[PDB]
Amino acid sequence: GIDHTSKQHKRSGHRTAPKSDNVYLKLLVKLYTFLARRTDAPFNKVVLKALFLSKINRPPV
Amino acid sequence: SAQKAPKWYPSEDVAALKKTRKAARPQKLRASLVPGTVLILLAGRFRGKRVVYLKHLEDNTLLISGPFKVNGVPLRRVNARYVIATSTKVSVEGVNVEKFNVEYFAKEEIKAERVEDQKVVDKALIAEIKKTPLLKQYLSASFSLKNGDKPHMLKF
Amino acid sequence: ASLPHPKIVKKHTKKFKRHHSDRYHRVAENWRKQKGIDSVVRRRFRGNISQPKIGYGSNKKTKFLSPSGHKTFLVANVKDLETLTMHTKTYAAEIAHNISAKNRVVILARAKALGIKVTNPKGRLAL
Amino acid sequence: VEPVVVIDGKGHLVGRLASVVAKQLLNGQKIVVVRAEELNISGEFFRNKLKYHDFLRKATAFNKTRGPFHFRAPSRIFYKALRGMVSHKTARGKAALERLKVFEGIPPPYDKKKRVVVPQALRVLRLKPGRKYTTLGKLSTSVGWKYEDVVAKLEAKRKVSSAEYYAKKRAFTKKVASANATAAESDVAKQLAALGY
Amino acid sequence: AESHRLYVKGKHLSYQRSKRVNNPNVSLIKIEGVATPQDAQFYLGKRIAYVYRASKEVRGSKIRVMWGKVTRTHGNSGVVRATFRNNLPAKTFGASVRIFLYPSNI
Amino acid sequence: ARYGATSTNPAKSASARGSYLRVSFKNTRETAQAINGWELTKAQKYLEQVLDHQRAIPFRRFNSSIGRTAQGKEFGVTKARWPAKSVKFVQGLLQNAAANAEAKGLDATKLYVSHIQVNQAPKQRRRTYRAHGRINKYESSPSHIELVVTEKEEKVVRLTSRQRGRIAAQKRIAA
RNA sequence: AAGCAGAACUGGCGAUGCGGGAUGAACCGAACGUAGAGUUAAGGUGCCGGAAUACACGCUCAUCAGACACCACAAAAGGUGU
RNA sequence: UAGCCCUGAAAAUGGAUGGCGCUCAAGCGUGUUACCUAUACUCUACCGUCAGGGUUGAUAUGAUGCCCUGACGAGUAGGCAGGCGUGGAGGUCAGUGACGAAGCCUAGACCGUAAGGUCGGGUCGAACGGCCUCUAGUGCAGAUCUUGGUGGUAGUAGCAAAUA
RNA sequence: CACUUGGCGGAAAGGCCUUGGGUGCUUGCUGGCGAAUUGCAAUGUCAUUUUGCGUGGGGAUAAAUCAUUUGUAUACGACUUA
Ligand SMILES: [Mg+2]
Ligand SMILES: [Mg+2]
Ligand SMILES: [Mg+2]
Ligand SMILES: [Mg+2]
Ligand SMILES: [Mg+2]
Ligand SMILES: [Mg+2]
Ligand SMILES: [Mg+2]
Ligand SMILES: [Mg+2]
Ligand SMILES: [Mg+2]
Ligand SMILES: [Mg+2]
Ligand SMILES: [Mg+2]
Ligand SMILES: [Mg+2]
Ligand SMILES: [Mg+2]
Ligand SMILES: [Mg+2]
Ligand SMILES: [Mg+2]
Ligand SMILES: [Mg+2]
Ligand SMILES: [Mg+2]
Ligand SMILES: [Mg+2]
Ligand SMILES: [Mg+2]
Ligand SMILES: [Mg+2]
Ligand SMILES: [Mg+2]
Ligand SMILES: [Mg+2]
Ligand SMILES: [Mg+2]
Ligand SMILES: [Mg+2]
Structure with a gap:
């Protein structure tokens, strides 16, 4: 018995992969997954998170 | 196809064993298990036989010969966990038990050489037994538990 | 023999039968979860039947293995038999139920020549 | 037991x-x-x-x-x-x-x-x-x-027969204890006494 | 001699239980002559056989054996706990078992 | 063809059938169960004694609210009856199977009823009229009867090393 | 007055099995994947029933004793009973 | 003055410290230990979930893969996710089959926590599956559900008005 | 251990105590010979119920029910009669 302060088995709430089945987007994700893991640059982690975003979360620039 | 396939198959290269850190150190016997101690056999075809402890063999077995002229138990190994060691002792240093080792009791009528090896060993055993009285009859008799016996209170 | 594997533990060998499937004939023994408000089976009262839950899940290192140690692959002909050629230690062929007897003779003959284990070699066997 | x-x-x-x-x-x-x-x-x-x-x-x-x-x-x-x-x-x-x-x-x-x-x-x-x-x-x-009456009557018969038995048993115990006392203080009795018996 | 006993007589009393729930994986054994947990520490770890007879001869004998061992003591009056390879049938509540003297230390 | 589950030699057996017979199934089951396993001549004379009310058919299953008789003392029951219609159908089939056994050449003195089975036939619908303009069913329960008469006809051991050694020791110690 | 009606705070039941209270939605303990081992909680250890007919100081003899946390009852008034 | 006991103390089927019983208690007040046992606590194993991470110049080709670490697991109403099954449709397995498809029966076997899947035997006689997808008139124990069939009741109540 | 002498035992006696001879054994004491290979442990099988079948030795040579019948009985069984 534990009185839990937080919700147990709570998901992180952020996307860990694109929702699409675009094969080219998925192999852009795996390129930047390698770069965000093997490089200390914060640029690679920001772009990797931005590749997951939905259509309304990446407005046209 | 009745069943489609596995997508990818497990490797059939068997993994090697990790390096075991388990050495084999010599077994510490009980304090009462010194050679010449009269033992009580607790299991086997020689259940309840009172035998004589002669040698600790390297396979963690006790070489006994409860003299074959006395109670008909030959030279054989027993496990130390199936034996009660009594306080009764006889001296050892008249028997040559260095001949008997682990491969002396290998497997593959009675063997010819086992008979005179028995006769050589027990000749000095009975010649030692005949000194103290009632020991030859003690070893001829077979131990058993009677009514009123409590082995937790009984000392052997 | 197959590959070496750990001692296979099932965690539950009894079949999970539906509640009151013994009591009524219309109630089949396929497991259904009790969803009634007052059900002692749903509420897990003592002395009642157990329910299928994820703690009974088999070890991943021995899941789907037969007691022979092989995983079961269903084959219908020689071509599906030959996919297990390099995997004799992990997969055992089992002939499909609708294979005719003359075709099964060819399948057993090929599996003996390829080293494949067959788990139903006596099916449709004239003797 | x-x-x-x-x-x-x-x-x-x-x-x-x-x-x-x-x-x-x-x-x-x-x-x-x-x-x-x-x-x-x-x-x-x-x-x-x-x-x-x-x-x-x-x-x-x-x-x-x-x-x-x-x-x-x-x-x-x-x-x-x-x-x-x-x-x-x-x-x-x-x-x-x-x-x-x-x-x-x-x-x-x-x-x-x-x-x-x-x-x-x-x-x-x-x-x-x-x-x-x-x-x-x-x-x-x-x-x-x-x-209660017939149990007490049959218990009186049983006690009479059992009391005559005890008198015969007591006489046999008296002569057995006389024989053990005669055979005590012998050399076997010293060793039995030394061994706690 | 007239006696050939190399074990101590015991009695299979019951399973390990609370008031309402029993555990057949652990049995309770009353070894005769044992009245304290200190006396029952001698028999701790000794092998137990429950020997019974069947009318069908299985492997050259009509006598079958269920093996077990004393694990711990139980209570204040010398009762011990026993674990068997297969659990005791619960019809043997009050049946005699054999407490062998091996494995031996004294 | 395709009788019930019998275990007899068909060469020593003869059979007879009657299907869709308008006779009570519940009475015919008890009549069949009364002569099951009997010798053919003993069963046939017993069925004449049932028709003459000298003996009775013991009613064992379909017997609720049946009157009691002294003639059930023979069979250890109290409820027994005299189903004269079921006896006539059963003994008609007994003499048919006896005729088929004589056609096959079987010995009549060794014949016994080895199999008899009464089974429920499709019911025949009739209509009965009740109070307040109501209509209920009025059904016959017919019988399929089959019976077969037959002539009355007339470990590798495993031992351990200990078990083998004890046997050899016992043979060498006892003369 | 009520196992009555109505509020405040909290904890519960509802929605929840488990050990204990013989029995019980709410009380006590403790909340739950499948198992093994050990130790416990509340409750208990004459027998049912697992566990001391344990140890120690006293009190009580009831021709309706007493052994009731919730809880399944008892009062004023009295007794050279002790 | 207050402890136990007693009087006060009367309800209806026979009955309730749970029962048996219990009297220097197996009762009451108190104290000290030992012992018993929950799905609780500690350790370990396995399952799942969540989280943090490792892993490419052969990651000894499967990156929704493999692996490491830690914690957690109650649940009605309800929400979401991953899967099982059925009728039909596009593709593929140049799939199965009159040397026996489908169906049905089988206290015979195997796999999966499960939905279910697979095999052996019997019966049978003409079609039917695996996988990737599409689609829905897609899963029943209840609805005094609908239709059909069948029981116990039960060889039972009864087949007794109108002279025979 | 069978054989035998006699007595006592009716609470459920079915047992207890006796007389005599035979036939063994005797560890009360002293000797000689044998055991092994069941292989380091596997109850390692030695008890007592019940029922068959077979062999060879004594012993004995019926009833009940149905059916018929009575009415001291009776819904039917049952009962009481012959
Ligand atoms: Mg299963
Ligand atoms: Mg199941
Ligand atoms: Mg179902
Ligand atoms: Mg509810
Ligand atoms: Mg216990
Ligand atoms: Mg009536
Ligand atoms: Mg009418
Ligand atoms: Mg509600
Ligand atoms: Mg409870
Ligand atoms: Mg209560
Ligand atoms: Mg107890
Ligand atoms: Mg007290
Ligand atoms: Mg949950
Ligand atoms: Mg489809
Ligand atoms: Mg084809
Ligand atoms: Mg078919
Ligand atoms: Mg079935
Ligand atoms: Mg056709
Ligand atoms: Mg629909
Ligand atoms: Mg339905
Ligand atoms: Mg429903
Ligand atoms: Mg209905
Ligand atoms: Mg009528
Ligand atoms: Mg009229």
Whole structure:
């Protein structure tokens, strides 16, 4: 018995992969997954998170 | 196809064993298990036989010969966990038990050489037994538990 | 023999039968979860039947293995038999139920020549 | 430790003897209880007769032949005390109930057997001196038991035959002890005495 | 001699239980002559056999054996706890078992 | 063809059938069960004694609220009856199977009823009229009867090393 | 007055099995994947029933004793009972 | 003055410290230990979930893969996710099959926590599956559900008005 | 251990005590010979119920029910009669 302060088995709430089945987007994700893991640059982690975003979360620039 | 396939198959290269850190150190016997101690056999075809402890063999077995002229138990190994060691002792240093080792009791009528090896060993055993009285009859008799016996209170 | 594997533990060998499937004939023994408000089976009262839950899940290192140690692959002909050629230690062929007897003779003959284990070699066997 | 334990019920308290017998029956011991007419209940005789009448008045209203059965014999009063201390509605408790035989007096073959006592149920050891008690044979005859006279007559015959036996046994023990004393102080007796025997 | 006993007589009393729930994986054994947990520490770890007879001869004998061992003591009156390879059938509540003297230390 | 579950030699057996017979199934089951396993001549004379009310058919299953008779003392029951219609159908089939056994050449003195089976036939619908303009069913329960008469006709051991050694020791120690 | 009606705070039941209270939605303990081992909680250890007919100081004899946390009852007034 | 006990103390089927019983208790007040056992606590194993991470110049080709670490797991109403099954449709397995498809029966076997899947035997006689997808008139124990069939009751109540 | 002498035992006696001879054994004491290989442990099988079948030795040579019948009985069984 534990009185839990937080919700147990709570998901992180952020996307860990694109929702699409675009094969080219998925192999852009795996390129930047390698770069965000093997490089200390914060640029690679920001772009990797931005590749997951939905259509309304990446407005046209 | 009745069943489609596995997508990818497990490797059939068997993994090697990790390096075991388990050495084999010599077994510490009980304090009462010194050679010449009269033992009580607790299991086997020689259940309840009172035998004589002669040698600790390297396979963690006790070489006994409860003299074959006395109670008909030959030279054989027993496990130390199936034996009660009594306080009764006889001296050892008249028997040559260095001949008997682990491969002396290998497997593959009675063997010819086992008979005179028995006769050589027990000749000095009975010649030692005949000194103290009632020991030859003690070893001829077979131990058993009677009514009123409590082995937790009984000392052997 | 197959590959070496750990001692296979099932965690539950009894079949999970539906509640009151013994009591009524219309109630089949396929497991259904009790969803009634007052059900002692749903509420897990003592002395009642157990329910299928994820703690009974088999070890991943021995899941789907037969007691022979092989995983079961269903084959219908020689071509599906030959996919297990390099995997004799992990997969055992089992002939499909609708294979005719003359075709099964060819399948057993090929599996003996390829080293494949067959788990139903006596099916449709004239003797 | 012996296959049949014969308990002399005289001077025993009913519920303390019933508790120790019921434990031994469930532990697999065969027990015979003799002389159930000499069991004791703590409390005055009128008090235990009043609670037996409270027991007698309990009966099934629509049919008295299916009600609680009020057994008047002292062996059956003791048997009612052991039931309830034994789970008698199961096969284990049923099988524990044929390991028990309760009698008034000491019938054959138990008159030639050795009778024991349970000291944690004995009235003299357990009950405080000065406290009153009733005898089960007196309570049974006050509630309907018809055989107090014939049990006491047959117990008088048994005690006469057993007392002549004891006189013959005592004479044989006197001459055996004379022979052991003659053969004592010999060389075998020194070694037996040195070995604690 | 007239006796050939190399074990101590015991009695299979019951399973390990609470008031309402029993555990057949652990049995309770009353070894005769043992009245304290200190006396029952001698028999701790010794082998137990429950020997019974069947009317069908299985492997050259009509006598079958269930093996077990004393694990710990139980209570204040010398009762011990026993674990068997297969659990005891619960009809043997009050049946005699054999407490062998091996494995031996004294 | 395709009788019930019998275990007899068909060469020593003869059979007879009657299907869709308008006779009570419940009475015919008890009549069949009365002569099941009997010798053919003993069963045939018993069925004449049932028709003459000298003996009875013991009613064992379909016997609720049946009157009691002294003639059930023979069979250890109290409820027994005299189903004269079921007896006539059964003994008609008994003499048919006896005729088929004589056609096959079987010995009549060794014949016994080895199999008899009464089975429920499709019911025949009739209509009965009740109070307040109501209509209920009025059904016959017919019988399929089959019976077969037959002539009355007339470990490798495993031992351990200990078990082998003890056997050899016992043979060498006892003469 | 009520196992009555109505509020405040909190904890519960509802929605929840488990051990204990014989029995019980709410009380006590403790909240739950499948198992093994050990130790416990509340409750208990004459027998049913697993566990001391343990140890120690006293009190009580009831011709309606007493052994009731919730809880399944008892009062004023009295007694050279002790 | 207050402890136990007693009087005060009367309800209806026979009965309830749970029962038996219990009297220097097996009662009451108190104290000290030992012992018993929950799905609780500690350790370990396995399952799942969540989280943090490792892993490409052969990651010894499967990156929704493999692996490491830690914690957690109650649940009605309800929400979401991953899967099982059925009728039909596009593709593929140049799939199965009159040397026996489908169906049905089988206290015979195997796999999966499960929905279910697979095999052996019997019966049978003409079609039917695996996988990737599409689609829905897609899963029943209830609805005094609908239709059909069948029981216990039960060889039972009864087949007795109108003279025979 | 069978054989035998006599007595006592009716609570469920079915047992207890006796007389005599035979036939063994005797560890009360002293000797000689044998055991092994069941292989380091596996209850390692030695008890007592019940029922068959077979062999060879004594012993005995019926009833009940249905059916018929009575009415001291009776719904039917049952009962009481012959
Ligand atoms: Mg399963
Ligand atoms: Mg299941
Ligand atoms: Mg179902
Ligand atoms: Mg509810
Ligand atoms: Mg326990
Ligand atoms: Mg009627
Ligand atoms: Mg009408
Ligand atoms: Mg609600
Ligand atoms: Mg409970
Ligand atoms: Mg209560
Ligand atoms: Mg207990
Ligand atoms: Mg106290
Ligand atoms: Mg959950
Ligand atoms: Mg489809
Ligand atoms: Mg084809
Ligand atoms: Mg087919
Ligand atoms: Mg079936
Ligand atoms: Mg056709
Ligand atoms: Mg629909
Ligand atoms: Mg339906
Ligand atoms: Mg429903
Ligand atoms: Mg309906
Ligand atoms: Mg009628
Ligand atoms: Mg008329």
